[model samples]
Target: KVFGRCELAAAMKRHGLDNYRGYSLGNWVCAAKFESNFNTQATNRNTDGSTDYGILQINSRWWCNDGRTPGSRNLCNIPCSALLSSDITASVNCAKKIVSDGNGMNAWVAWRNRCKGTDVQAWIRGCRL
Candidate 1:
């Protein structure tokens, strides 16, 4: 749902991930390779007995309030689909705000120093902004 994109842009601007996007492809590929094969609908039970959800693996209960509906937060549902709705920027921005109060960049930071190389700027090949 949300993982790839100008993820490098988000990493660079929000977290100062100057090299993560370009140098973390391997980690990305590997983690992605082993971690549910990069699938957006993966889940796992935490030690405390909570469920993780989505591609990047957001905690559904954290954002959800109701679980009766398909988009409900209950039963492993996400409160904010925006986090996994193909809106990478919105998702990261939301996470950054919540986790860092505007300074959290750990996700990108880990990728920057741990993943393989990537020319993030290259992703903007056919855009018009």
Candidate 2:
């Protein structure tokens, strides 16, 4: 299911994205907006032949195993297909792992270019949070 702005914000906060690695909930919401437009089933294939999966666009090259990308860490230790589920626990947890791996949200370029080091208060402004 696609999420509206506040819906995604609240969901993210519940999953502990708030202030994670020095970034606010707005940063996450803003990135998800650009990354997948709140799409749980989103997927993108790169020129390198690895695929990015789910809302946060976790990549098969380093995060999940698509059984296609060579040298995949499969660090999340799940099939990349898991990221596509509407149940977001896997995606949320893996996203945290991606950041906790010390990459921060820079794991997703959409976050860096669209939400990083920027005022994204408006991304969550209407959310009751």
Candidate 3:
């Protein structure tokens, strides 16, 4: 499912992404806007052949397993396909783990290019928390 910006923002907040690791909810919202357009079923193939899955585009090479990527660490210990769930619990949890691991929010360049250094408030402005 593709989410509207505020809908995505609300969902991220529900998943404890608000101010997670110093990144605001809007930052997370904007990252998804560019990363996957808040599409739960989104997938992106990296140049190295690793796949990114779900709204946050968690990578298969390190964060998840697709049973195809070479040398997958599967640190998320979940099949990448699970990230496609519209529930978003898996993807949200995995994303929390990503930054919680100190890998940084810049893990996805979308966050760096689109959300960083900008006023992310607009992404969640009308959501009313």
lDDT of 3 by residue, 33-81 (tens): 8889889999978899999899989999898989889887899889998
Lowest lDDT sum, 10 consecutive residues, model 1, at: 16-25
Q: Give the TM-score of candidate 3.
A: 0.95
TM-score of each: 0.38, 0.94, 0.95
- After TM-score superposition, the amount by which residue 67's alpha carbon in candidate 2 deviates from its true location, in angstroms, is 1.0
lDDT of 2 by residue, 18-121 (tens): 99887888888888899899999999989999998888888899888888887768988999999999888899899988988877888789888888878888
Error of 2 at 128 (Å): 1.8
RMSD of 1: 8.1
Better of 1 and 2 by TM-score: 2
Give per-residue CA lDDT, model 1, range 22-111, as digits (tens).
Answer: 333233333332433445545655555444544444444454322423343432233544444443444334343333433323343433
Residue 69, candidate 1: Cα error in Å is: 16
Give the range where candidate 2 is weakest over 10 consecutive residues by summed lDDT: 99-108
lDDT of 2 at 58: 89
The parts of candidate 2 lying over 4 Å away from their true place are none
lDDT of each: 0.40, 0.87, 0.87
- In order, what is each prediction's RMSD in angstroms? 8.1, 1.1, 1.0
Q: How close is candidate 1 to the true structure, as a TM-score?
A: 0.38
